[PDB]
Backbone as ProteinMPNN parsed JSONL, in Angstrom:
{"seq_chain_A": "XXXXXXXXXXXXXXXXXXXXXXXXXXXXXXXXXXXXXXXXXXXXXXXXXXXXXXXXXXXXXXXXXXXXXXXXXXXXXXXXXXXXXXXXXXXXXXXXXXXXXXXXXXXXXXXXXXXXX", "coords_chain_A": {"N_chain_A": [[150.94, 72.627, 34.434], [152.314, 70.093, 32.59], [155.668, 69.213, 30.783], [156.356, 69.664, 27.452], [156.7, 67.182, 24.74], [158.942, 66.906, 22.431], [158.957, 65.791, 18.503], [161.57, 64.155, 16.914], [162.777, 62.448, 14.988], [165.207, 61.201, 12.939], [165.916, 59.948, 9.427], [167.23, 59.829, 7.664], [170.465, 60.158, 5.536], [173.064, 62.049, 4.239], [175.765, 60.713, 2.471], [179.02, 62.684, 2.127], [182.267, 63.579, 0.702], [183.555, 65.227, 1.692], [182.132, 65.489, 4.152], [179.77, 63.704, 5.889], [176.651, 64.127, 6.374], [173.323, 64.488, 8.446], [169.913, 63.648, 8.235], [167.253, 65.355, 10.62], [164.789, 65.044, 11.475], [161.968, 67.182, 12.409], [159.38, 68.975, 14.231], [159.48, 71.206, 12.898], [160.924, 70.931, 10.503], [162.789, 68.91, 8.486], [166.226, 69.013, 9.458], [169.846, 68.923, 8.375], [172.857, 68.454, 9.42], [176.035, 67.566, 11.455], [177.558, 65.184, 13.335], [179.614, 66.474, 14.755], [179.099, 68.419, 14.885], [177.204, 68.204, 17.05], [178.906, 67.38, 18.99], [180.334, 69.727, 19.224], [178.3, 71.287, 20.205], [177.909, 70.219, 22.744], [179.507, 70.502, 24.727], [180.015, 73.236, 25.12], [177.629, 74.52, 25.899], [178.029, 73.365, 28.079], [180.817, 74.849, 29.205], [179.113, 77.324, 28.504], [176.856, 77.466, 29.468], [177.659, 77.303, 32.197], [176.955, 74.894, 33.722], [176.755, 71.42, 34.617], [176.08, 69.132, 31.884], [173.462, 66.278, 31.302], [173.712, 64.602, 29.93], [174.421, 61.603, 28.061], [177.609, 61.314, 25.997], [179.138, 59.561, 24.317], [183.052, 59.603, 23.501], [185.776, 59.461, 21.232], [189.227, 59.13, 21.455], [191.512, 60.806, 19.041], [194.533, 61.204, 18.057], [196.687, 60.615, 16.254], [196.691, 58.131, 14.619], [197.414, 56.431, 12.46], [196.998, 53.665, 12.409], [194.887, 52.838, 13.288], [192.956, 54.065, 12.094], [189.893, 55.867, 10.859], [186.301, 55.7, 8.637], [185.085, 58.421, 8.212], [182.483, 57.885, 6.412], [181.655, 55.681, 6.652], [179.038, 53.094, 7.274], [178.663, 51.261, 9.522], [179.793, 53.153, 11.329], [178.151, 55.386, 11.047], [175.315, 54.062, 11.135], [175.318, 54.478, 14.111], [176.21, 56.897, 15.258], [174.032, 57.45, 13.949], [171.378, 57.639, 15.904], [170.841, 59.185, 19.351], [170.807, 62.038, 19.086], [168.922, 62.409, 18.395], [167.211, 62.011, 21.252], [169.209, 63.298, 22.801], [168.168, 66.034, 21.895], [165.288, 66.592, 22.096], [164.969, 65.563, 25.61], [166.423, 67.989, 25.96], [165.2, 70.727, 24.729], [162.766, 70.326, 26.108], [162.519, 72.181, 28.499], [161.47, 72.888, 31.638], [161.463, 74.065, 34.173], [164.304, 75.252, 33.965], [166.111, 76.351, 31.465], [168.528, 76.831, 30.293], [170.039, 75.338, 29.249], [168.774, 75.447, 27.057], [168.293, 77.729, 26.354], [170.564, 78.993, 25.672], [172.984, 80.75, 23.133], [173.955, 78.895, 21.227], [172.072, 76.835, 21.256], [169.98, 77.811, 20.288], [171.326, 78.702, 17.451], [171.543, 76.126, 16.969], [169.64, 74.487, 15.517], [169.287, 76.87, 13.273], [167.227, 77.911, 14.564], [166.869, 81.259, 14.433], [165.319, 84.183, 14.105], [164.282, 84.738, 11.27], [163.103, 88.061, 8.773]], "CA_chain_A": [[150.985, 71.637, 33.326], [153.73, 69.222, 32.403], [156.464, 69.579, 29.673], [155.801, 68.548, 25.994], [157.987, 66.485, 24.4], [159.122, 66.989, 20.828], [159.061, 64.634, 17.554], [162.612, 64.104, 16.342], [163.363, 60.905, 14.287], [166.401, 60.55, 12.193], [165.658, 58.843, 8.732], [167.945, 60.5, 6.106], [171.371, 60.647, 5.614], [173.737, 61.957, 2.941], [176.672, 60.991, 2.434], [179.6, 63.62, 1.337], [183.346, 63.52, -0.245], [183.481, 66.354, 2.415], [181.899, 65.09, 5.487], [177.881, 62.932, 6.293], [175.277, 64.801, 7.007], [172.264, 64.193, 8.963], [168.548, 64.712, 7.998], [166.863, 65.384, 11.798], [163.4, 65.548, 11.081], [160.957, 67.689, 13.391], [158.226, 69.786, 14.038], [159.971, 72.498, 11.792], [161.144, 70.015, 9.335], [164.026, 68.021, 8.554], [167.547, 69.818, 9.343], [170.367, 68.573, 8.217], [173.927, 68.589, 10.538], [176.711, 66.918, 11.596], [177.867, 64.53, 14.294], [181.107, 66.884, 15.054], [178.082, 69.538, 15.235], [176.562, 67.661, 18.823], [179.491, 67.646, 20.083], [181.202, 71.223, 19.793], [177.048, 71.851, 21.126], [177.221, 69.8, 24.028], [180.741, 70.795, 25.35], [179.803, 73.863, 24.711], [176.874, 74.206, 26.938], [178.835, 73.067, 29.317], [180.973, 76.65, 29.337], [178.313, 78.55, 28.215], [176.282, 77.758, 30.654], [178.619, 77.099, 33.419], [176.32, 73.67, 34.352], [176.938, 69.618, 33.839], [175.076, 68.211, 31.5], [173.131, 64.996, 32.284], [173.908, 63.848, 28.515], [175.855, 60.652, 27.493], [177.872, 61.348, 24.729], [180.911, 58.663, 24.185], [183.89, 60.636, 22.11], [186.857, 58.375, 20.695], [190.417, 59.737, 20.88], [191.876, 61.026, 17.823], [195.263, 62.061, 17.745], [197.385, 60.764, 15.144], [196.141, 56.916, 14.502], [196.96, 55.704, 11.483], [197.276, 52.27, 11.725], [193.637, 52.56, 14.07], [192.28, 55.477, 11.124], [188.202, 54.837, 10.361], [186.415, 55.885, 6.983], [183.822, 59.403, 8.121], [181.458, 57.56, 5.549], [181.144, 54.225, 7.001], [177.718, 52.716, 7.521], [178.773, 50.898, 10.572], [179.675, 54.086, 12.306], [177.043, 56.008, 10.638], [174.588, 53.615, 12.127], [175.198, 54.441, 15.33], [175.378, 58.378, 15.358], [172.233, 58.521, 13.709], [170.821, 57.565, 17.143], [171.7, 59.625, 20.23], [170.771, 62.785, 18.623], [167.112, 62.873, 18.772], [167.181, 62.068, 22.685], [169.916, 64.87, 23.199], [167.245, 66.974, 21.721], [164.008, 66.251, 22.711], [165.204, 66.451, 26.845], [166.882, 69.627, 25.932], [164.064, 71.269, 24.336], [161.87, 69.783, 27.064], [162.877, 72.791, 29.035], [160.572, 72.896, 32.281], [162.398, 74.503, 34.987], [165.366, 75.848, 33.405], [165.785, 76.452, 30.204], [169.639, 77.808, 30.321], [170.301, 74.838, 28.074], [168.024, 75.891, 24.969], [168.131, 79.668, 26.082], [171.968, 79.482, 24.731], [172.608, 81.018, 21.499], [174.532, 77.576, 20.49], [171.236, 75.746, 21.069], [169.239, 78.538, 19.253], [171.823, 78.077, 16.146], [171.771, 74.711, 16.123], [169.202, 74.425, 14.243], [168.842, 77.908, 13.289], [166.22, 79.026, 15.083], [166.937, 82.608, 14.764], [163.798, 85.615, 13.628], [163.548, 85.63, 10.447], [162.084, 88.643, 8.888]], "C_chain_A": [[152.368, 71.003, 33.211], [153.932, 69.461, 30.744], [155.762, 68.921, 28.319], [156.981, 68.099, 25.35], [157.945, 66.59, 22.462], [159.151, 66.045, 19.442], [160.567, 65.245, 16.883], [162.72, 62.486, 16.17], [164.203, 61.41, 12.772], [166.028, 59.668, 11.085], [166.665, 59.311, 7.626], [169.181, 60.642, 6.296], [171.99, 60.913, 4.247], [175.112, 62.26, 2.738], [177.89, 61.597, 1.49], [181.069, 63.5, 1.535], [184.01, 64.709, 1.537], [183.391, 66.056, 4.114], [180.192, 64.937, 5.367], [177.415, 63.829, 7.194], [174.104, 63.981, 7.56], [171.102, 64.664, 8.892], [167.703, 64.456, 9.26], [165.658, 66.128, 11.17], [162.738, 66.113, 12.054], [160.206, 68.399, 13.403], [158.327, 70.729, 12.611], [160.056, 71.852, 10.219], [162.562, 69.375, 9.319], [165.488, 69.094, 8.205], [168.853, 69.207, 8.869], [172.251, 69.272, 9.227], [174.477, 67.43, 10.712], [176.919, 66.502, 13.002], [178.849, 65.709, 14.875], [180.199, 68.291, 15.425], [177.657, 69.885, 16.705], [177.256, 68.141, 19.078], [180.093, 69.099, 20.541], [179.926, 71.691, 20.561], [177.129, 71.83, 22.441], [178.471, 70.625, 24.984], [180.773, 72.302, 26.094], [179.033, 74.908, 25.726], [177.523, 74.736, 28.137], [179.605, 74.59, 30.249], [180.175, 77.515, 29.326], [177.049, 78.974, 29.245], [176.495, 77.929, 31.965], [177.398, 75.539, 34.299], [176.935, 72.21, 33.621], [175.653, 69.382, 32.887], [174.821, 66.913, 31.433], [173.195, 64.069, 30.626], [175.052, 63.102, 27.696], [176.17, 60.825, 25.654], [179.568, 60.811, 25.02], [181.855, 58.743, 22.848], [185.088, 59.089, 22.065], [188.037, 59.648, 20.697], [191.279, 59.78, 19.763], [193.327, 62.029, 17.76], [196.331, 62.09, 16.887], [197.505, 59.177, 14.656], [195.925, 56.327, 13.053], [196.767, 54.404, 10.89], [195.286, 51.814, 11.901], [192.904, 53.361, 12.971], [190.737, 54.832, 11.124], [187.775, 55.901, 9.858], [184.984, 56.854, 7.941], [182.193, 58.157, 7.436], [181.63, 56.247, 5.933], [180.055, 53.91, 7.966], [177.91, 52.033, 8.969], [178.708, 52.266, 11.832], [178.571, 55.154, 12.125], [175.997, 55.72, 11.145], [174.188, 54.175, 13.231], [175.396, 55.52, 15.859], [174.691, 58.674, 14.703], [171.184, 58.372, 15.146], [171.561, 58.4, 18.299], [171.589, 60.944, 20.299], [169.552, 63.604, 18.776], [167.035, 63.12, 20.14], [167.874, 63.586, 23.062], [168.826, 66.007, 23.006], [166.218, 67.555, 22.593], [164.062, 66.608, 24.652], [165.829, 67.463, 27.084], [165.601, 70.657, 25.923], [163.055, 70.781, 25.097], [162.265, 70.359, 28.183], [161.37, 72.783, 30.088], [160.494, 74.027, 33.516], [163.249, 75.442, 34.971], [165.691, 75.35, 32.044], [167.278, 77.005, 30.07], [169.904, 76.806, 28.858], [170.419, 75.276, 26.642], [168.286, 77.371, 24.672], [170.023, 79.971, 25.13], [171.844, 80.016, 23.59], [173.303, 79.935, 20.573], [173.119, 77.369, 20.039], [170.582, 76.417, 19.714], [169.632, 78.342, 17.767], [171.916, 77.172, 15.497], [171.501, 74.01, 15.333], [168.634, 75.279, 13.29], [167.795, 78.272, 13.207], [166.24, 80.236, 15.826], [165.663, 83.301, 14.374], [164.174, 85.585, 12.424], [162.97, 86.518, 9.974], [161.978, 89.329, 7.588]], "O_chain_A": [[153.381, 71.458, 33.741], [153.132, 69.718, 29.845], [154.938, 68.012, 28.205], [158.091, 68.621, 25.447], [157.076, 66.367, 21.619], [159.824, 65.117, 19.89], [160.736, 66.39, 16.463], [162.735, 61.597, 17.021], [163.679, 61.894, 11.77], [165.752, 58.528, 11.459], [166.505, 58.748, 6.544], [169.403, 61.31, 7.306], [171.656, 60.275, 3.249], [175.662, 63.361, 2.757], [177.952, 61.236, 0.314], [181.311, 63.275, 2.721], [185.048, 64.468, 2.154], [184.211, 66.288, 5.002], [179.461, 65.802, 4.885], [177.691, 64.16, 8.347], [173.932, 62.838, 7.137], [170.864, 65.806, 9.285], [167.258, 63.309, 9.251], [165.527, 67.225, 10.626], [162.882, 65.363, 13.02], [160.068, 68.819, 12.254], [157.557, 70.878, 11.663], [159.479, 72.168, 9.178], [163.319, 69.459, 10.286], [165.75, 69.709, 7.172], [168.672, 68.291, 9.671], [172.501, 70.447, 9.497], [173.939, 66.374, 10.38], [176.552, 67.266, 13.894], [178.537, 65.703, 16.066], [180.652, 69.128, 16.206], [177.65, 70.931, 17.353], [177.088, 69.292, 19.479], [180.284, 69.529, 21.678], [180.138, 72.43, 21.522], [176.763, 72.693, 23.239], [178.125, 71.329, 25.933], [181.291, 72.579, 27.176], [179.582, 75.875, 26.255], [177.592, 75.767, 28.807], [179.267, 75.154, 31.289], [180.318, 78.519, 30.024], [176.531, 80.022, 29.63], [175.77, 78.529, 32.759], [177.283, 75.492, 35.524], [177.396, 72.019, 32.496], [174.469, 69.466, 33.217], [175.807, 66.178, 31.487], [172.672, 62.969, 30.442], [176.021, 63.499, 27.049], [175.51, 60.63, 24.633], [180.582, 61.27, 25.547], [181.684, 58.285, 21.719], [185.083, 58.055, 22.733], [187.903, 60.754, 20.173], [191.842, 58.722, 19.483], [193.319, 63.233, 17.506], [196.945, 63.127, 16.633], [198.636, 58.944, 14.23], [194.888, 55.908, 12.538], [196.533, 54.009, 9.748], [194.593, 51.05, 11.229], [191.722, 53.083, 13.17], [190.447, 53.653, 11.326], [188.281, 56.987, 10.14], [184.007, 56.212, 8.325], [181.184, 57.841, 8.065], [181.821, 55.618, 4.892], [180.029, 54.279, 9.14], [177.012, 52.429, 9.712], [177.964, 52.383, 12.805], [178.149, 55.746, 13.118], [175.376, 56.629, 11.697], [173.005, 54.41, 13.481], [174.929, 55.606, 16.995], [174.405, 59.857, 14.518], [170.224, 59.137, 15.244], [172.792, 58.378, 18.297], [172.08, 61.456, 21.305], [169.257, 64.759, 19.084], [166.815, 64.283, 20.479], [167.33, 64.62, 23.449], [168.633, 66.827, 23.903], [166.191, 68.481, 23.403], [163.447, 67.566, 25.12], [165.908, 67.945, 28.213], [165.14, 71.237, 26.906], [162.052, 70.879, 24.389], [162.486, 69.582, 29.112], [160.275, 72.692, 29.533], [159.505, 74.737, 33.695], [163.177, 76.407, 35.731], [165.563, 74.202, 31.619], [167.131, 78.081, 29.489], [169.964, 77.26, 27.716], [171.231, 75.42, 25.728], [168.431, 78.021, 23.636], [170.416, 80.821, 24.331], [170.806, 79.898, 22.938], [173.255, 80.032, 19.347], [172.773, 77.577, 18.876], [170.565, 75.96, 18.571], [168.825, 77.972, 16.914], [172.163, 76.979, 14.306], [172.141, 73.234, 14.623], [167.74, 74.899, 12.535], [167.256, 78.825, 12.249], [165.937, 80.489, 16.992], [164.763, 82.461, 14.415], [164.601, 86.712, 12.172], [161.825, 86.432, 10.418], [161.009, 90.049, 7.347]]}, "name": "protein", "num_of_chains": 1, "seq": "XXXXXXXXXXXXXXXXXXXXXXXXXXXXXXXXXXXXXXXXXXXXXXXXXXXXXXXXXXXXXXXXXXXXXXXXXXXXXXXXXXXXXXXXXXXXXXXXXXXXXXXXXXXXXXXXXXXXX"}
């Protein structure tokens, strides 16, 4: 049989004094997480699994920019990591083959899907 592919769509956000959250809706239900979340995930991976991953994710350098500074809570940039997120997912969790990806205990946390009991 061939893989199944997951429902993740992005419709909710809320923004915080603190740092914007993300409501990632899916099978389970809608999780909420941060952009700064992906990335320590994906990087992450990367070590944890000792493989490349085949997933574009375009970072901005940040190292002491204040004339360049930009506002966490702005809708422009907000926009555009609410997309990017679902995909990452969805061919993650669309493990077929190898599964080292999801088998991590990042992935597992990410959206904590630990046992309950």
């Amino acid at each position: 049989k061939m893989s199944e592919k997951l429902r993740i769509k992005v419709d909710d956000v809320k923004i915080n004094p603190k740092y914007v959250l993300y409501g990632v809706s899916t099978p389970n239900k809608r999780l909420y997480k941060r952009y700064s979340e992906f990335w320590k995930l994906k990087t992450r991976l990367e070590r944890d699994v000792g493989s490349t991953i085949p997933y574009d994710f375009p970072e901005k350098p940040g190292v002491l920019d204040r004339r360049w500074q930009r506002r966490y809570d702005d809708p422009e940039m907000i926009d555009e990591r609410r997309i990017g997120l679902e995909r990452f997912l969805n061919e993650l969790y669309n493990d077929r083959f190898d599964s080292r990806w999801r088998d991590t205990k990042i992935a597992q946390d990410f959206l904590q899907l630990s046992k309950p009991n």
